[model samples]
Target: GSDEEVDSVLFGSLRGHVVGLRYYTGVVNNNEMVALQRDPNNPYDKNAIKVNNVNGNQVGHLKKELAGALAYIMDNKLAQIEGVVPFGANNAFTMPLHMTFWGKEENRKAVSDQLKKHGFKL
Candidate 1:
């Protein structure tokens, strides 16, 4: 699905620098894309989240947006994954978290600005 495509773009853009990321679709019965999480109760672990799709084009747009977001993160060097997995609705989502080695407030602010440019708030 488009979600998976977005995830792939993000992953590809990272170029192996990403340590971990995951995506999932809520097709429990189908068991399409569901990655095991470190904390079983963590909802944030779910990747791609959920978006109402009226048509394939909408889905495609979402994927493109996700891809752009990923590009932004990678270009800014503000994303990192501790674990990577594919899961849910045929694994239709990409979830990547920022990784850092600890630094000054200004450095963190710069990263935040980059993320903001990609439509992330806070």
Candidate 2:
């Protein structure tokens, strides 16, 4: 079994605006989705995932946080790339949500470069 940690950070110094990107790989679990769905108090319930923006540092909330951020980007057309597909047995029942940033060609390149700076790749 292989488990990896994928993380994203909001850069507040860049243009005086909080902007960042996230990446995810490996097995997708539908159980995680169900957990998000059932939790009424979870911020992610509405967007398929949620995050605690008030507390900058926290654990056990990464998944929903990423999901919420992805939704924000997609809804505003700010994401450069967004992909969702099935990858495992559970994939048949629940679609794996894969997402990327940079909605426009130019923005894609810029975002790609930023990711590279952080040792991440498309």
Candidate 3:
């Protein structure tokens, strides 16, 4: 059992923008795609890991039942790094949705350095 948090905002190589985790959860918007991780310190889900688009904005992790395939994609560097957002109810995300990327640390450092360069925050 673990708990992780996700956070994302399409400011860099991403394409979507999340206001917050709950802000969109249970909501509806089937046009976003996020990367997957295996963070186990999330407050939302134990096997949390739904931080899409390394902008590091913050979107909290998702349900455990919805994070299996996404992890695989990331583990194998599947597609370009992003999966389709399949709405569940009320146009909200229901299952695990994400694509696999190639540069994990690379993008992370890029975002980190970018933030430090702009004097954003650590």
Candidate 4:
């Protein structure tokens, strides 16, 4: 059963804001790859996913409901920062990410269906 499935569901994109971008000052840059950290212990939101720059400085976080779905899949999948553009006053910014998951077709399907419940089409 090693035949690769050609039409597996993968890849998700989101335009997320760096809510703490102004606080990080000179950490992030153009087209930089950021890290996503899961914060199950966050007092505010247990499903919090903090966005950190490669420099290890936290830039912001993924939205609440989105994080809920992504958090469940992060244990088995991985994501990437597609683009980072700073705008607004005091260096505020937005991050566009493209997340890709790895695993057997069954695993992919499970994640896919879970995301679907969160209104994610892909």
lDDT of 4 by residue, 25-121 (tens): 6345555666667784688675677767565667657767667787776644533223343432234554344343434456766666776788631
**Can you write out model 3's per-residue Cα lDDT over 1-122, one digit (the tens) per residue?**
11211233243332222223554554434455444556646565443445643443334354444343334334443323443444422433334433323333434555445434544210
| lDDT preference between candidates 3 and 4, better one | 4
Better of 1 and 4 by TM-score: 4
Deviation from native of the Cα of residue 39 in model 2, angstroms: 16
**Model 2 Cα lDDT, one tens digit per residue, 1-122:** 11211223322211111111122222333322111111235453543332212122111122334444444443443333322222322322223233322244434444445444543221
Q: How much lDDT does each candidate structure score?
A: 0.29, 0.29, 0.39, 0.54
- The numbered model that scores best in lDDT is 4
Clashing pairs in model 2? 44-49, 44-50, 50-64, 79-103, 80-101, 80-102, 80-103
In model 4, which range of ten residues has the least summed lDDT?
A: 80-89
Question: Against the true structure, candidate 3 has what lDDT?
Answer: 0.39
Q: What is the lDDT of residue 59 in candidate 2?
A: 12
The model with the greatest TM-score is: 4
- Worst lDDT window (10 residues) for model 3? 1-10
**Candidate 4 residue spans exceeding 4 A from truth:** 1-27, 75-95, 98-103, 120-122
Q: What's model 1's overall lDDT?
A: 0.29
- Cα error, residue 42 of model 3, in Å, equals 6.8
Candidate 1 has which clashing residue pairs, if any?
19-81, 20-81, 25-88, 32-88, 32-90, 33-87, 33-88, 33-89, 34-87, 34-88
Select the stronger candidate by lDDT from 1 and 4: 4
TM-score of 3: 0.32
Local error of candidate 1 at 23, Å? 14
After TM-score superposition, the amount by which residue 95's alpha carbon in candidate 4 deviates from its true location, in angstroms, is 4.9
